Amino acid sequence: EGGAAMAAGESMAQRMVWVDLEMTGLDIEKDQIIEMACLITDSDLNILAEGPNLIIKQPDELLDSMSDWCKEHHGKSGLTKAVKESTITLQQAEYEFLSFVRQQTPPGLCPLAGNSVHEDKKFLDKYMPQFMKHLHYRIIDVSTVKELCRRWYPEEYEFAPKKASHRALDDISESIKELQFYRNNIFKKKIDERKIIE
Amino acid sequence: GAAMAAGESMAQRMVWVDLEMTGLDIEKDQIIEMACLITDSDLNILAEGPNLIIKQPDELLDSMSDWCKEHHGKSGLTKAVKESTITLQQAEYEFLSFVRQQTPPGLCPLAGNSVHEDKKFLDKYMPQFMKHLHYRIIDVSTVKELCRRWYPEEYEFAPKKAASHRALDDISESIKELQFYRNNIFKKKI
Ligand SMILES: [Ca+2]
């Protein structure tokens, strides 16, 4: 029956693809991608799968030509060291994600999720196009609600969680924890604590 | 101290835009129409920018998709492109001039419906303008997707975007949409 595929299809079309990227800089015409994580959640931000957490090999030239902040940032992170000794091609990494997201999402219906992802999509559109061809053109920006919280709910902004990490996969988990804080505190309450709300 | 409160009050103004390309192939597509507008933090419009139509080389206009051909052909917009005398470089200045007197430099974000795609062409074709803007954005298409999943009943009350033929009136729908999500999806305080 289609009514079952509809319920199943309409439920997967509400899932999100959560990514966290690290790059050599902000200039898309010269900078590249060096670390990418992926992860799938449902409409209520519950982990349905954990994608890989990869480090992409990039030539020593670009890393040696990175900005002070960038060359300093990724140095203490040790990520710069791993990039050189990495053996993961971009498309080899691009495909590894594409297979993961294909076995978990319908093609062209799920949106990109994550914190400040208008830049991640900007890079994935250029460098991982087959990946983006699977995803909806829209994004779920955890920072968009951070701004709307900053102006509309400054009181509860002070209680927002604090930073914490080691892998982009963890920066995803914090970004959901960030977004989950917004649903508990600034959106309309659906649940009293002991009835539910009208 | 009181000035730092008003300084914060200005740091929370938004910069609203909406563009119309010949296509989404950023490496081979250009901007064709643009409007701009400013609001305070609580979505009240403070100043409306211009609404300009950018002349673009003719071979590309008949090389854009049948969607872009028929739709912009039906909008009357592609006709105004040839009859436009505004280039990209002067258009950027007019928009850069407008916003500089209303918003603090680099403290205000882009806002609108899927502006992540409007910013992609602004990061490339209007960098002097984008320098005045914060790197963060405010996409109403993000809380729309959040409204579907979490508040689907109230999501059905969503108004129809009035199919505006001018990008400045398109924004009026986006704000009216965003104001909706605030009223019926965000927690009220008293
Ligand atoms: Ca638009």
Numbering used by the authors:
A (entry chain A): 28 to 191, 193 to 221, 224 to 228
B (entry chain B): 30 to 219
What does the publication say?
REXO2, a homolog of prokaryotic oligoribonucleases present in humans both in mitochondria and the cytoplasm, was earlier shown to be crucial for maintaining mitochondrial homeostasis, but its function in mitochondria has not been fully elucidated. The human Orn ortholog was proposed to be REXO2, also called small fragment nuclease (Sfn). We postulate that REXO2 plays dual roles in human mitochondria, ‘scavenging’ nanoRNAs that are produced by the degradosome and clearing short RNAs that are generated by RNA processing. The protomers of the dimer adopted a typical RNase H fold of the DEDDh superfamily with a central five-stranded β-sheet with strands that were ordered 3-2-1-4-5 and strand 2 that ran antiparallel to the others.
We crystallized the full-length protein that lacked the N-terminal MTS sequence. These crystals diffracted X-rays to 3.1 Å resolution and belonged to the P 32 space group. The asymmetric unit of the crystal contained two dimers of REXO2. The active site comprised Asp47, Glu49, Asp147, Asp199 and His194 and had the typical architecture of the DEDDh superfamily. We observed only one Ca2+ ion that was coordinated by Asp47. The presence of only one ion is most likely attributable to the fact that Ca2+ ions do not support catalysis. Each dimer in the asymmetric unit interacted with one molecule of RNA that was located at the active site. Both RNA molecules comprised three nucleotides with an AUC sequence. The 3′ terminus of the RNA was located in a pocket that was formed by Glu49, His101, Cys97 and the backbone of Met50 and was shielded from the solvent. This means that the RNA could not continue in the 3′ direction; therefore, the active site could not accommodate a continuous RNA chain.
